Design a protein around this ligand. Structure first.
Ligand SMILES: *[C@@H]1O[C@H](CO)[C@@H](O[C@@H]2O[C@H](CO)[C@@H](O[C@@H]3O[C@H](CO)[C@@H](O)[C@H](O)[C@@H]3O)[C@H](O)[C@H]2NC(C)=O)[C@H](O)[C@H]1NC(C)=O
Ligand SMILES: *[C@@H]1O[C@H](CO)[C@@H](O[C@@H]2O[C@H](CO)[C@@H](O)[C@H](O)[C@H]2NC(C)=O)[C@H](O)[C@H]1NC(C)=O
Ligand SMILES: *[C@@H]1O[C@H](CO)[C@@H](O[C@@H]2O[C@H](CO)[C@@H](O)[C@H](O)[C@H]2NC(C)=O)[C@H](O)[C@H]1NC(C)=O
Ligand SMILES: *[C@@H]1O[C@H](CO)[C@@H](O)[C@H](O)[C@H]1NC(C)=O
Ligand SMILES: *[C@@H]1O[C@H](CO)[C@@H](O)[C@H](O)[C@H]1NC(C)=O
Ligand SMILES: *[C@@H]1O[C@H](CO)[C@@H](O)[C@H](O)[C@H]1NC(C)=O
Ligand SMILES: *[C@@H]1O[C@H](CO)[C@@H](O)[C@H](O)[C@H]1NC(C)=O
Ligand SMILES: *[C@@H]1O[C@H](CO)[C@@H](O)[C@H](O)[C@H]1NC(C)=O
Length: 728
């Protein structure tokens, strides 16, 4: 009987979740930012002592976008003048502050408009990229050494990624990898020479007279891809007398015969490196293990240290092949692999033996390998209570695979079912982050005897606040189709009367290996819709979804816009059968792949849905990028899968839209899913006389994430929903 969670609450952020992010700097010490000062805490006991006062950079005379303290705490890097590029990427200005000297380093600075900077992982070495060339600083205040002379805008990329590698392979702008003690610096070089440009307008500030045409090399399904080459430089033997020597490590022969990608870079020991390559047909990948050769100065990659990974029913890995975690000697390694039942479990490999041995089994999956000591492997999975939507930390005894113990399931069972972990430098201590179903809880533990020394943050203040608002409840459950469990979640309005009939809004993503039904606690506009508009908001994970094995995940192989669409419809039906849903009032909405699925549903003719909103939807797979799209579809040639490409487009369903209300929204500057896709949607709809609502957002990207634009889009969608449900 209090006040509700309102749209203004959501947009103005009035009820905020506290976090606690630390950074381990040793085996028993981490850094936190309490009251804008950086403090160093000592886990072994309790003490805490100031590492850097907030006042230190009162004198900088620059808005400070980001900082990064070197591994040895001697130097701090200061990032200012951030100017955005894509997603994960930018340009900035950098200053280095000597913590001993308590002085800014003014001689030999890092050039303006730098693309990326990393410290070496142990000293205070620096690698940065500027105009697409790599530069190394050994001592922070002496001339950088230029590693590459070959970089060229939009063509050659040394040490940073091009659009497609950034978005779809590495999930980062960086393409540098230091060896553990910073001796070697491994890097990739991308070549976009023959890759087609996507072009689009940028309007900018009202005063720019002629719009800017932005050009990005971007391969669409089937188009010419970038090429990759791999190098390693020895940073200890750099010199100003002599251009650095980068040794090129060449891909395996099974890759050289055709288009390929470099999909993983992992260091095994101070002198051993592992590279994973993937064929453009993502059926087939090879791991190469290369040793450094103290005499010749090169890198030896023995065949029969190679390890082939094939998929007979889809692609390798969940999104890419998984990364290996080597033992300390680097002669054996652990790696998540899909087993005979098609469930992803931990595999134990010898670098010279083709076969591997599974150390876990079961109808549940390993999410990630988190830490590896000599005695124990620490990993996260969804085994607990057979819920694919939960996460917990487990540790498995390396001498007895039967001795696996669960470090988080009993910590706080009714409140915490979604854990992620951050380990100290030798897995001595670890922090546990709990994400739901209750409010997020952050604790600290020592792994010696698993004791929970400290509660870092519990969101008491937030809990207090939420007592005095009518919050919605969340149900998480499953239904059974064809002898298989498919989970869903529902956000249910306050005072939920099982007898009344509520309007329903399907929240959809449904992309391959996705998962919208989980145990995470959230404060978002579904909260607003449930709390204030008495509207049930639902998500469902049908065919081709994650973390339940390959029977479900690979179900949509070679055929997007089929099974997952069907299943989202089926879930609206199944929700009707439950009897508290007013079936004259089911909307559906989704962004990106979810916009694609929303559109496909609205055009299905099913007659189940009254209206939908599609934000930045894919409309036709030949429009999306090669890496992502071909992973699930192969090439759009008629020798391959062209039929399923063409059968599966939004525009070909245009007629059916005559039965539904449709809102179509897209940012004009979306470099990911191009405005093109929606331009094509609205064009087909016009061409068959269908009415619909639309909205462009000038200059927004795929995120539509800028403040004003974000409150605007949610307000607009709110009005469309409230109107479509004929609610006040
Ligand atoms: C990045 O990719 C481009 C595209 O391949 C590379 O440029 C191309 O390099 C090839 C050789 O690898 C050149 O072919 C040669 O051309 C000459 C005459 O042009 C011919 O007589 C030779 O026998 C050979 O056929 C080609 O010209 C060139 N193409 C373009 C578009 O410039 C480029 O070198 C790559 N950069 C890298 C990997 O660093
Ligand atoms: C390292 O390599 C570069 C690139 O080839 C050399 O730079 C060129 O040097 C030539 C010959 O002096 C000049 O004609 C060019 O103007 C230079 N290009 C650039 C971009 O500088 C450079 O001399 C080499 N340095 C060392 C130590 O050998
Ligand atoms: C980082 O590892 C490197 C390479 O393994 C270590 O350097 C080697 O050490 C041995 C014995 O000291 C030498 O004989 C090799 O020639 C070195 N390899 C090089 C420099 O290429 C080095 O000790 C490690 N770095 C630190 C800080 O300990
Ligand atoms: C900076 O640090 C001091 C001392 O701990 C603290 O009292 C002060 O509020 C801080 N300033 C800001 C604005 O965060
Ligand atoms: C914490 O206290 C211990 C024992 O009194 C001391 O040796 C150590 O220096 C302290 N650690 C820090 C980071 O101050
Ligand atoms: C960066 O650009 C500014 C503004 O033009 C200039 O004052 C400064 O010299 C530059 N800094 C560096 C490190 O070159
Ligand atoms: C994918 O690889 C398989 C073997 O793993 C190959 O036989 C097939 O033709 C490839 N592409 C598909 C699934 O058409
Ligand atoms: C169950 O069986 C039918 C017929 O084989 C199939 O078309 C349907 O998609 C299946 N349902 C699911 C969700 O697998």
């Amino acid at each position: 009987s209090r006040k509700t969670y309102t749209l203004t609450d959501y947009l103005k952020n009035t009820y905020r979740l506290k976090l606690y992010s630390l950074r381990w700097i040793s085996d028993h010490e981490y850094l936190y930012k309490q009251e804008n000062n950086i403090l160093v805490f000592n886990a072994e006991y309790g003490n805490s002592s100031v590492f850097l006062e907030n006042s230190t950079f009162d004198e900088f005379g620059h808005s400070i976008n980001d900082y990064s303290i070197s591994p040895d705490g001697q130097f701090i890097l200061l990032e200012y003048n951030y100017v955005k590029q894509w997603r994960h990427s930018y340009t900035a200005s950098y200053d280095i502050y000597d913590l001993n000297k308590r002085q800014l380093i003014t001689e030999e600075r890092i050039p303006n408009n730098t693309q990326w900077v990393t410290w070496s992982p142990v000293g205070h070495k620096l690698a940065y990229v500027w105009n697409n060339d790599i530069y190394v600083k050994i001592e922070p205040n002496l001339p950088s050494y230029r590693i590459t002379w070959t970089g060229k805008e939009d063509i050659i990329y040394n040490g940073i990624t091009d659009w497609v590698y950034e978005e779809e392979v590495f999930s980062a702008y960086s393409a540098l990898w230091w060896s553990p003690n910073g001796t070697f610096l491994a890097y990739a070089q991308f070549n976009d020479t023959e890759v087609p440009l996507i072009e689009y307008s940028f309007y900018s500030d009202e005063s720019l007279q002629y719009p800017k045409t932005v050009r990005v090399p971007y391969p669409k399904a089937g188009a010419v891809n970038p090429t990759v080459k791999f190098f390693v430089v020895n940073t200890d033997s750099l010199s100003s007398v002599t251009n650095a020597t980068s040794i090129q490590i060449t891909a395996p022969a099974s890759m050289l015969i055709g288009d390929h990608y470099l999909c993983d870079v992992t260091w095994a020991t101070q002198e051993r490196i592992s590279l994973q390559w993937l064929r453009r047909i993502q059926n087939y990948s090879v791991m190469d293990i290369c040793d450094y050769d103290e005499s010749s100065g090169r890198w030896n990659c023995l065949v029969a240290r190679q390890h082939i990974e094939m998929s007979t029913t889809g692609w390798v890995g969940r999104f890419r092949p998984s990364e290996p975690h080597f033992t300390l000697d680097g002669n054996s390694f652990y790696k998540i692999i899909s087993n005979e039942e098609g469930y992803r479990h931990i595999c134990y490999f010898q670098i010279d033996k083709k076969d591997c041995t599974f150390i876990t089994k079961g109808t549940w999956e390993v999410i990630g390998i988190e830490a590896l000591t000599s005695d124990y492997l620490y990993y996260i999975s969804n085994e607990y209570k057979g819920m694919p939507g939960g996460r917990n930390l487990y540790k498995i005894q390396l001498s007895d695979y039967t001795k696996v113990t669960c470090l988080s399931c009993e910590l706080n069972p009714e409140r915490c079912q979604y854990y992620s972990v951050s380990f100290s430098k030798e897995a001595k201590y670890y922090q546990l982050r709990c994400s739901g179903p209750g409010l997020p809880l952050y604790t600290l533990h020592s792994s010696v005897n698993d004791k929970g020394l400290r509660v870092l943050e519990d969101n008491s203040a937030l809990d207090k606040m939420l007592q005095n608002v009518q919050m919605p409840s969340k149900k998480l459950d499953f239904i059974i189709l064809n002898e298989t469990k498919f989970w869903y979640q529902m956000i249910l309005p306050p005072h939920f009367d099982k007898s009344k009939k509520y309007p329903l809004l399907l929240d959809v993503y449904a992309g391959p290996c996705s998962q919208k039904a989980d145990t995470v606690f959230r404060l978002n506009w579904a909260t607003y819709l449930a709390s204030t508009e008495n509207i049930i908001v639902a998500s469902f994970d049908g065919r081709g979804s994650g973390y339940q094995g390959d029977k479900i995940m690979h179900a949509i192989n070679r055929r997007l816009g089929t099974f997952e669409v069907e299943d989202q419809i089926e879930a609206a039906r199944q929700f009707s059968k439950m009897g508290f849903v007013d079936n004259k009032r089911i909307a559906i909405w989704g962004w990106s792949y979810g916009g694609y699925v929303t559109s496909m549903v609205l055009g299905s003719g099913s007659g189940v849905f009254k209206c939908g909103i599609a934000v930045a939807p894919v409309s036709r797979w030949e429009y999306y990028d090669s890496v992502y799209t071909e992973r699930y579809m192969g090439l759009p040639t008629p020798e391959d899968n062209l039929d399923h490409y063409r059968n599966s487009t939004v525009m070909s369903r245009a007629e059916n839209f005559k039965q539904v209300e449709y809102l179509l929204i897209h940012g004009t500057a979306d470099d990911n899913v191009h405005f093109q896709q929606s331009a094509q949607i609205s064009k087909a709809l016009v061409d068959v006389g269908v009415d619909f609502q639309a909205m462009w957002y000038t200059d927004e990207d795929h995120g539509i994430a800028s403040s004003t634009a974000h409150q605007h889009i949610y307000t607009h969608m709110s009005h469309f929903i409230k109107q479509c449900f004929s609610l006040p």
